[PDB]
């Protein structure tokens with residue numbers, strides 16, 4: 001039998017189905033101020049039939065910014081704009097989580113406070129690109145700036161920034177928060193030995209590498225409730241030039257066992273980037289499942305059939321779709337009815353306006 005269209009308790013909220021909208025950066029916010037817009041509100045409202053919407057990555061602070069057009073959740077104006085957006089999703093009987101990030105070294109000095117180098121675990125360039133805007137407001141890809149290593153005494157401020165952003169998210173009407181601990185952003189920069197060469201209590205051993213993310217988890221659980229907190233990890237493979245080191249499986253299971261102790265709402269595993277790669281072994285999925293007692297969300301080039309298979313095997317609880325959610329506001333109905341999926345238009349994934357954003361039709 002099909003399980004994708006059955007309900008699921010996700011911490012404090014109940015999803016009516018297991019077809020989730022993955023977090024999707026679309027870079028359409030207002031500058032100055034990194035402000036969400038009514039257009040963004042319309043886009044999310046169109047997708048409110050999702051079992052859970054997980055928002056685009058959203059800054060915890062101005063320092064957190066790495067992309068021109070990505071929204072924040074640190075200023076009064078951002079809070080006010082997000083309130084309207086969550087109200088719109090709720091008017092359509094949806095549920096929405098905010099994905100909260102600090103981009104760390106995947107950033108550029110031109111968009112940092114004071115024009116300064118972005119921060120990271122260590123002073124190592126990401127060796128990739130980020131997205132800025134040109135003089136006409138269009139998205140452009142630009143090489144990342146070499147970061148400054150955070151001083152030990154700056155770490156509590158980073159934890160506080162996540163805490164504060166969660167207070168703001170609760171006020172803004174989000175149902176859950178998802179900590180962005182994946183894809184080579186700040187939390188992952190600390191987790192990975194490839195990006196973390198620190199020799200203090202925040203580098204070296206896996207305990208030390210996971211210290212920041214677990215301090216963040218504890219701070220946000222205390223601010224709100226554990227049943228309001230999710231986390232996204234990409235702990236197996238390489239993402240955006242950040243690998244997971246020479247003991248990736250053991251290190252992942254350590255982190256997951258620690259997360260389980262906090263009783264958080266969910267663990268969201270980004271299994272691959274768009275270029276693909278090694279599938280998770282069944283054995284690894286089993287080791288994760290026996291250690292974590294919240295919801296597990298699988299993501300990365302899934303099909304409905306793969307989701308059904310893994311849900312049926314008792315290994316995951318839900319699936320997050322990314323690109324299919326860009327193109328199909330009613331993806332739930334389409335998967336339920338076995339309807340075709342709208343053609344994707346990748347040229348309009350990042351930046352611009354309504355075209356390629358709010359103009360994909362329902363059935």
Ligand SMILES: Cc1cc2nc3c(=O)[nH]c(=O)nc-3n(C[C@H](O)[C@H](O)[C@H](O)COP(=O)(O)O)c2cc1C
Nearest residue numbers: 022023024025056057299300301302321322323349
């Ligand atoms: C345009 C675009 C933006 C994305 N933005 C985010 C993001 O903000 N946060 C995140 O964790 N992953 C982000 N991702 C990754 C997706 O959540 C997802 O893992 C990826 O698209 C693979 O899943 P899919 O095959 O269902 O599209 C993004 C992907 C795309 C294509």
Ligand SMILES: O=[N+]([O-])/C=C/c1cccc(O)c1
Nearest residue numbers: 024025057180182183273274
């Ligand atoms: O084209 N992409 O696959 C983008 C992925 C992405 C883009 C922004 C943030 C993040 O965590 C992942």
Ligand SMILES: O=[N+]([O-])/C=C/c1cccc(O)c1
Nearest residue numbers: 025130131183239240273350
């Ligand atoms: O995790 N990622 O590899 C993200 C990549 C990305 C993120 C934002 C814009 C873009 O063109 C690519």
